[PDB]
C-alpha cells in the first residue's frame, strides 16, 4: 500500500473575519463526511517564534491521508473538492501544498 | 495532553550530491533512536504536477510528533539535534517549518 500524505500550509487574507475563516476550516474538515477517500484530517495553528521561527508567514497547517494516489486523484477531481477549492484558494494570502508517499 | 506536530518542507542546495542528500535524510531519521522525544518520523518527496502543482519549489516533507512543547524544546537544543542542525540548515536552499497542536 502506497499511502499518500497531503499537507497544506496557508495564511488567510487579512480582510476575512475570524467567523469567515472558522467557516472555511469547518467546511474543509466536513469534506471527510462527503469524500470517503479523505482520512485522518487534522489541522492546527503555528505556535510561533517562541517555539521556532521558520514558518515564513504561514499560520495554519492541514493534514489529510489517502490510501492511494488513485484515491487522492478521485478526491481532488470530485465535484465537492472542486467546489471547496474555489472558496479556499482565493481566501489564501499564501499557500503551499505537498503530496507525498509516506516513508518510515 | 497537548501533542505537537512538527512539519518541515525543504528544498536542497543544488551543489549537493544525491548521496549526501540521502545521508542527511538518514541522519535526520536517526535522531529518533537517540531522542525519545521525536516520534513517528516520516518523510517523502513531492509527487509533482501530475498530482498537484502547488509545492512552490519545495521537494521534501518531513513529519514528526512530540509529546509536548517542553519535549520539543528539550529535543531541539539537545546535542544530537544541534549537531544535525549544522548539516541540515546549510543544506537547505529553502525551508518552512510549522509546529502546531492537533485539532480534529
Ligand atoms: N526544524 C527542523 C528539523 O526537524 C530539525 C532541524 C535541526 C535539528 C533537529 C530537527
Automatic annotation (TrEMBL), chains A, B:
Organism: Passiflora edulis (Passion fruit)
Domain Stress-response A/B barrel: 4-100
Assembly notes: Homodimer.
Gene behind the chain: PeHNL
Keywords: Lyase, Signal
GO biological process, one term: pollen tube adhesion
Source domain of life: Eukaryota
An example Gene Ontology molecular-function term: lyase activity
Protein name: Hydroxynitrile lyase
Whole-protein coverage range: 29 to 132 of 147
Amino acid at each position: 500500500p502506497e499511502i499518500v500524505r497531503h499537507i497544506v500550509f496557508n495564511r488567510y487574507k487579512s480582510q476575512l473575519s475570524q467567523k469567515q475563516i472558522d467557516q472555511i476550516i469547518a467546511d474543509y474538515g466536513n469534506l471527510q463526511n462527503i469524500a470517503p477517500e479523505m482520512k485522518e484530517w487534522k489541522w492546527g495553528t503555528d505556535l510561533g517564534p517562541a517555539v521556532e521561527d521558520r514558518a515564513d508567514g504561514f499560520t495554519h497547517a492541514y493534514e489529510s491521508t489517502f490510501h492511494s494516489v488513485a484515491d487522492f486523484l478521485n478526491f481532488f477531481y470530485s465535484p465537492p473538492a472542486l467546489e471547496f477549492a474555489k472558496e479556499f484558494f482565493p481566501a489564501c494570502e499564501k499557500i503551499v501544498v505537498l503530496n507525498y508517499i509516506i516513508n518510515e
